[PDB]
């Protein structure tokens, strides 16, 4: 494949145009009074929406290079949401902001290396400011507080959320399942979770969630890497006639067996999916056992000669539910006997006796939690199935922000937070004058979001922005009501975490480009 | 296939444009403060990086001819790393440097035959200078020294490395495996290695390494060349239901049986690989046997009537691990009974009694080494699987430089070494004036690396360069800190070996071109 | 197929451009200080080389006609080598030389018929001169002499070569096999050779040699023409399970059976080959019998009813090796019992008793030779496998020249010989003035090689050429050292045979063209 290569401006310019489209197309949907975009559908009527994430999703340009520029942003803007639950759009909005100016500068003659530096500083600083401005969120009050707000005023919601964490704790594992009747339900059941994503997106059965929800399937707990499909045939056929799904946990899976399942499911008879096992090496040993214990399943160790072909359902584990996302597996309600489960706990507990290390003691501990801790669940109750699954959505949302709000507190959410922080460090200087500009850009870029909202609401950006600078603290303008005040009291906020994330990620990608001198790709 | 043919300049010019792209695209990533390039991925998000090696890898031009020029460099610049562990980029950088000027010259009217000559001299000379400036690296101090440095300050690293060599010797065979826990582990075990690479890149299972790591597979010890696949069927199916990989060692393998395996593995059931046997003729005889012993396997000799179809696992050898690269195989931990191995030693040892030659005594000896010498292993301990495998990486790196550092010592690593040597032999003249020029180009080309770094850091090349010339010895400029001093004391150096290699290879290819008068290739 | 037709110039001009490319591209690599050409490779890195033969190989133009002109040269230039072991390039160079001028002439108005004539005379004459200049090569001194020289100074080489011939005679049959150890080995063994080449290029398993080396394969001694594959199945299958190669010898083979084996081998199970039988009619009878005896194989005569389906391994013959080329087959070490062989001799010897003719006696004689004469083999000893097979190469080289040297002595080899002879017959006139010119062209064309070398070395052609004309005998200029002297004493020579060959062949094709008036080919 002969490539097409561009340098300096030629390169950067393309990337710029590229990004812009993305931004210009996704930014118009920002405020609570955002405009809408039309996403043409292949089959049928087009789709109208104001959801930037969706918009962004569809964006892909013909001009490679320009297209790269776009994808480069989308990527990190996604990562932002990935690690905060929102911002996806905002990050993009800022991303442009920076890139645009900083990219004129480089092209104006100014040194890029510094520009980047200047910015990073600005960010770095503002990030602190954010920490300052942030308002703690600890008590079940603060908790239900934010919840209901992010749940859109709905108090019942924030409520459960607070109750929840009040049960399995703030770090506890909470989940959501459609309600069976009209009543909401909160139950705590033997469960567990760990960071480990599916080995194939083609496993997803919940497109809008990019997740995989399975119904009380069986569970496999291998001890080797699974490359060849042969070993499965026995069990794989057992669960086939068992009429239930099946989850797998082991070292890993080579396409041979992997690529097969993927297809075997994506429009195939038995539909199942699998994910690596948590921890590595000596750790994993126990780690998987804990799981066995909990799911009442048998662990197939080759270090025991027991092979996969040598395995029947009696050897599998089982839970009532289980979901997987891009990088996290969690199981609900393990059939494992309390006698068994609890006992295991004793075992471990004991083991923590050695305490030969605050790492080993900390490790055993962590397992104790996962296993003894449990997983709390919720069942969004509702009248109609619509409101039902709808409500269920808002919930999962709120839950997010809340965890975040908890982690890093919260701040003014109309893009306010940024405006504030900016006006703060408005003197902040750098060595090279090229760094000052670097800083300006950064700062002036933080005005973007707000200005954009105002704009999308058909209001005067410059004007609103100004008066917002005047005030202090979480004093801002509520675009949705056109009334200024305490954005937070007015129930308009953003988990400190996300705002930061967004801003950092944008800065990240920005300098990244500002320092890019070459671009390679295929020929048209 | 009707070819397209160009001569003299027509040829050379294309070659030049060709090279430049490669260099202009890979050189921006040189300094510690290098810029980054964006490599477009077919599926998904583009890739940003500052790793020249990666960049280079992706480079391929549409214009054949121009594309040749590029591949021609890539080739030798690769060979450089191949025989030094780094420089890949640098070599390239210099490559251009020379090529550019010397190619204008030829095109200016000057004699090419001389220009080349003039250069080679300059190189020749500078190579010596390097020997001079080169600071030895022998004691375990200098070893863990350089190691911990190339490992990026991490002293724990340079440590194990010194220990290692301190175990199986400087020439001993050291390997690396992921750590089971958090602790690093250094163990010596019955193992071996020999210069013989895979007979198919399509065997690689470690892309970024271009290596084939196999998990305690079975081993084959044939005694013939293998063309037809038949013979395997018995065993090939045995290790199939054995669920383990398998390694082969014999005369060689014709596509018939070879090509089949290639596919058989690249997206195939039983995934395995094979390599030629060390030594030739009478030599190989014992050679292989030695291995058998170590692996506890049986050698299938046709000179015994024994055939492959006539073979069961009881004849395969075994080692917990084994890895192959472009041109070198190495197995780890042979299951052969110590009684056996050690016994075999006795045999050979005695055999050295003949001593009927310092080649035969030398030979028998070497074998004694491989076998009884053993192979040292290292398990990179770490908290996280990320860091873990990450750290593991840096290790293998350091190890490299070290081996090289040992072989030839080390020198100033900021391109410094070159600047130095250049300013040194700055009078150096040649017969034909076309040789002086030849020499200049050469020398002035040595300033390339440094200047480029300075450049990439957004600093004044000409200026830094100058002041570096001023000082002497290993006195240079640390681009990462913007402070001049003892590049070596500042922990900034390069294994004498690599710098030379790089420089020699660059010089090689350059003249090669400068003396190229014709170019053949297919038609667009 | 509608053709495209050109006449006179239209035709000749195309041929000219055609030839030029070939020559301009291959000539640059003539001297010991030749420049190099780059031969693009489909997969991977391009190839750099200074080997005309290779370059030539790759040459094929898009413009049919022009392409023809090229191919026409290549063909004969190859034949040259074919019948001398070198010159391939040189021939081409001269080829151009003549063609260029003489073709201008025809196009200038002069008569073609004479031009050709005029040249042929010049050649004719110069060929004699060459005989004069030629210095014999007979005693084992001159023999080891020239060998070691062509072997590139390596005396050890020229040694064995002299020894060899010193064994089975100058006309004896000598071969080369890789050495088993480090020591060189010369052995005489029951074996034989005869002028008969493979019936398919797709048998070559030794590309760079265009040879077919087979390891101790079985041997078939048929008596009819093999058209149908059937007859083989019994035996073809026995050797399939016997796991060894197989050779055939009979009347001939029709695609039906032929084309099948071709593919059967080229990427196929059983991989073997076959060549026509020595002698025609009455002669072939005995002939094959002699072979049978030697290999201990059975002769399948249809004049005995015995068919091929009616034949087992007990009927095949065997030799430890056997190699075929474009037109010569030779077997090594036939299992035939000495009692049998030596006995077969007694038989023949007697038969020579008849002496009824000096053709019949001569013939019976020859057979005696082939059989009892035996085949001298050599085993290039070497440290490394590289050097080994490498050295092995140079050997075969030397051997060639030596044979030729023997046949016609040797001469100055820097293109010297030609310059000499040229300056000699510098008056030589012709009838038609168109013939004088014919003669000039010819002569002036002999300066080509030398001039080209000097040129490639970056030296003054005109000048050196001049001073060489000045001297006499084998006094020439060594381009490699830039020192004039006795080219032969300086170890720079050419088997009288080759020089001639080259020169004649070039002359051949040249006039051939000069006398061409029409050209036919397919349409673009």
UniProtKB/Swiss-Prot annotation, chains A, B, C:
SUPFAM superfamilies, sorted: GroEL apical domain-like, GroEL equatorial domain-like, GroEL-intermediate domain like
PANTHER family linked: 60 KDA HEAT SHOCK PROTEIN, MITOCHONDRIAL
Name under which the protein is recorded: Chaperonin GroEL
Reactions listed under catalytic activity: ATP + H2O + a folded polypeptide = ADP + phosphate + an unfolded polypeptide
Localization in the cell: Cytoplasm
GO CC term (a single one): membrane
Record: residues binding ATP: 29-32, 50, 86-90, 414, 478-480, 494
Primary residence: cytoplasm
Keyword check for ATP-binding: yes
Gene assigned in the entry: groEL
Keywords, ordered alphabetically: Acetylation, ATP-binding, Chaperone, Cytoplasm, Isomerase, Nucleotide-binding
Organism: Escherichia coli (strain K12)
Phenotype upon changing residue 1 to S: Complex stability is significantly decreased.tuberculosis
Activity regulation information from UniProt: During the substrate-folding cycle, the two GroEL rings separate for effective substrate binding and chaperonin activity. Ring separation is triggered by ATP binding to the trans ring of the asymmetric GroEL:GroES complex and avoids formation of functionally impaired symmetric GroEL:GroES2 complexes. Activity of the GroEL-GroES chaperonin complex requires Mg-ATP. UMPylation of the chaperone by SelO/YdiU negatively regulates its activity, and may facilitate survival under stress conditions.
Subunit structure: Forms a cylinder of 14 subunits composed of two heptameric rings stacked back-to-back. Interacts with the co-chaperonin GroES. Can form asymmetrical complexes, composed of one GroEL and one GroES, and symmetrical complexes, formed between one GroEL and two GroES oligomers. The asymmetrical complex is the functional unit. It was suggested that the symmetric heterooligomer may represent a transient intermediate in the chaperonin protein folding cycle.
InterPro entries registered for this protein in UniProt: Chaperonin_Cpn60_CS, Cpn60/GroEL, Cpn60/GroEL/TCP-1, GroEL-like_apical_dom_sf, GROEL-like_equatorial_sf, TCP-1-like_intermed_sf
UniProt modification remark: Phosphorylated reversibly during heat shock.
Modified residues (N6-succinyllysine): 33, 50, 116, 276, 320, 389
Domain writeup: Each subunit is composed of an apical domain that binds non-folded proteins and GroES, an intermediate domain and an equatorial domain that binds ATP and is involved in inter-ring interactions. Forms a large central channel that appears to traverse the entire length of the cylinder with no obstruction. The central channel of GroEL functions as two cavities, one in each ring, that are separated from each other by the crystallographically disordered 23-amino-acid C-terminal segments of the seven subunits. The entry and exit of polypeptide seem to be restricted to the apical end of each ring. Modulating the volume of the GroEL central cavity affects folding speed in accordance with confinement theory. Small proteins fold more rapidly as the size of the cage is gradually reduced to a point where restriction in space slows folding dramatically. For larger proteins, either expanding or reducing cage volume decelerate folding. A stepwise reduction in cage size results in a gradual loss of cell viability.
Family as reported in the entry's similarity comment: Belongs to the chaperonin (HSP60) family.
Effect of residue 108 to C: Forms inter-ring disulfide bonds. Prevents ring separation and leads to the formation of high amounts of symmetric GroEL:GroES2 complexes
Function field: Together with its co-chaperonin GroES, plays an essential role in assisting protein folding. The GroEL-GroES system forms a nano-cage that allows encapsulation of the non-native substrate proteins and provides a physical environment optimized to promote and accelerate protein folding, probably by preventing aggregation and by entropically destabilizing folding intermediates. Also plays a role in coupling between replication of the F plasmid and cell division of the cell.
């Amino acid at each position: 494949a002969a490539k097409d290569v561009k340098f300096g401006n030629d390169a950067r310019v393309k990337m710029l145009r590229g990004v812009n489209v993305l931004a210009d197309a996704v930014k118009v949907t920002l405020g609570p009074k955002g405009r809408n975009v039309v996403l043409d559908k292949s089959f049928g009527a087009p789709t109208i929406t104001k959801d930037g994430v969706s918009v962004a999703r569809e964006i892909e340009l013909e001009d490679k290079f320009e297209n790269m520029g776009a994808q480069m942003v989308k990527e990190v803007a996604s990562k932002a949401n990935d690690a905060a639950g929102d911002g996806t759009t905002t990050a993009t909005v800022l991303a442009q902001a920076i890139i645009t100016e900083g990219l004129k500068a480089v092209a104006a003659g100014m040194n890029p290396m510094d520009l980047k530096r200047g910015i990073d500083k600005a960010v770095t600083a503002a990030v602190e400011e954010l920490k300052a401005l942030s308002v703690p969120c600890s008590d079940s009050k603060a908790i239900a507080q934010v919840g209901t707000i992010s749940a859109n005023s709905d108090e019942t919601v924030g409520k459960l959320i607070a109750e929840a964490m009040d049960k399995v704790g703030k770090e506890g594992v909470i989940t959501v399942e459609d309600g069976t009747g009209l009543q909401d339900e909160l139950d705590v059941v033997e469960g567990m979770q760990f960071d480990r994503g599916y080995l194939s997106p083609y496993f997803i059965n919940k497109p809008e969630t990019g997740a995989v929800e399975l119904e009380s399937p069986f569970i496999l707990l291998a001890d080797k890497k699974i490359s060849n499909i042969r070993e499965m045939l026995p069990v794989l056929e057992a669960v086939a006639k068992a009429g239930k799904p099946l989850l797998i946990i082991a070292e890993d899976v080579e396409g041979e067996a992997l690529a097969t399942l993927v297809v075997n499911t994506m429009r195939g008879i038995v539909k199942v999916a699998a994910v690596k096992a948590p921890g590595f090496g000596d750790r994993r040993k126990a780690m998987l056992q804990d799981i066995a214990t909990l799911t009442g399943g048998t662990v197939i160790s080759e270090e025991i000669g027991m092979e996969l072909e040598k395995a029947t359902l009696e050897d599998l584990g089982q839970a009532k539910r289980v979901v997987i996302n891009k990088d996290t597996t969690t199981i609900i309600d393990g059939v494992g006997e309390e006698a068994a489960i609890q006992g295991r706990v004793a075992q471990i507990r004991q083991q923590i006796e050695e305490a030969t290390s605050d790492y080993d003691r900390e490790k055993l501990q962590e397992r104790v939690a996962k296993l003894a801790g449990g997983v709390a669940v919720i069942k969004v109750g509702a009248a109609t199935e619509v409101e039902m699954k709808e409500k269920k959505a808002r919930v999962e949302d709120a839950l997010h922000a809340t965890r975040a709000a908890v982690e890093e507190g919260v701040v003014a959410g109309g893009g306010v937070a940024l405006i504030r922080v900016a006006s703060k460090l408005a003197d902040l200087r750098g060595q090279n004058e090229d760094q000052n500009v670097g800083i300006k850009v950064a700062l002036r870029a933080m005005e973007a979001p707000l200005r954009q909202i105002v704009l999308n609401c058909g209001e005067e950006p410059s004007v609103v922005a100004n008066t917002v600078k005047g005030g202090d603290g979480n004093y801002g303008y509520n675009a949705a009501t056109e009334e200024y005040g305490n954005m937070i009291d007015m129930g308009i906020l953003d988990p400190t975490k996300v705002t930061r994330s967004a801003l950092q990620y944008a800065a990240s990608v920005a300098g990244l480009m500002i320092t890019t001198e070459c671009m390679v790709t295929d020929l048209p």
